[PDB]
Amino acid sequence: HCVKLNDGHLIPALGFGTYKPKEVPKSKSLEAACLALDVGYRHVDTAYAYQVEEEIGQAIQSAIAAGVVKREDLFITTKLWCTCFRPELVKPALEKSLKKLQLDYVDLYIMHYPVPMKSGDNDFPVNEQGKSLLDTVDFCDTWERLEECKDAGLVKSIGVSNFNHRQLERILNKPGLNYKPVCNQVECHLYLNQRKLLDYCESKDIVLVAYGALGTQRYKEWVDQNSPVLLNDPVLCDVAKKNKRSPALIALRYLIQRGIVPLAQSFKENEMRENLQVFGFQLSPEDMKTLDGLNKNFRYLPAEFLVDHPEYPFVEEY
């Protein structure tokens, strides 16, 4: 199951996410990527800023060396981080990611955010008060260098992450645009269903890719009864029981049926295998409408480290 991108390439309709919490040893990301490949994932989404590209690359090479997959069978995404948005730094940042990944090209390379930060080795440069050290780079200038990377054959498709409507319009309307973004990767789940941004993206043939697809599971959310937890939602539970699937699978299927490509994040074989079963059932029109009703516009990943920049993406309505 794939989704057609606006440049003719195809993206598998479910991806494997590789975000790694800081406390987790990086070797566990290597293990999880090998397991995901064995389970049957072919779309692997990573990012320079997750600091596990080397592990993901080693997993891929080990699976290729084992003969279980060929490179052409895989769809690999990585991301340009905020500290590398200066135009002269873009192609070298991709080349470094490719070296770490042990790849000659990626299938998809995306701007991680629309906001640039001070260049340098620290991914989260800060002043003595902890405020982010920000830059003045127009993301349209960064975009021109991603286009150059595509023309150089280092990446098949290019896109963005965490852009709002106004920012997508800036790219689409920029003078001398060569390639439209193929995707906008954003937080998206039953509690932040992204209807408005989705409808815009559909109108421009931009695919919405979802991270954080199961909402927050942080301790504080479970303790405060007033703060709803998506995986504990009683309406979701009713739909899950009706369809004889888990709440998590309902939550992922909801996104798939709206044309969104979710990234399923897990270190556990059983969950990896369950999530891949999302193509084995369909939600009815009534159930989709019930699930639409869960939206709360709860953004759990607001990227507060970017809030002081004029291009902070999340204050605007969409």
From Swiss-Prot:
The active site is at residue 50. Substrate binds at residue 112. Keywords: NAD, NADP, Oxidoreductase. The keyword Signal does not apply. InterPro entries: AKR, AKR1C, Aldo/ket_reductase_CS, NADP_OxRdtase_dom, NADP_OxRdtase_dom_sf. It comes from the Eukaryota. Its EC number is 1.1.1.-. Belongs to the aldo/keto reductase family. Catalyzes the dehydrogenation of 17-beta-hydroxysteroids. May also exhibit significant activity with a variety of cyclic and alicyclic alcohols. Uses both NAD and NADP, but the activity is much greater with NAD than with NADP. This is Aldo-keto reductase family 1 member C13. It comes from Mus musculus (Mouse). The gene is Akr1c13.
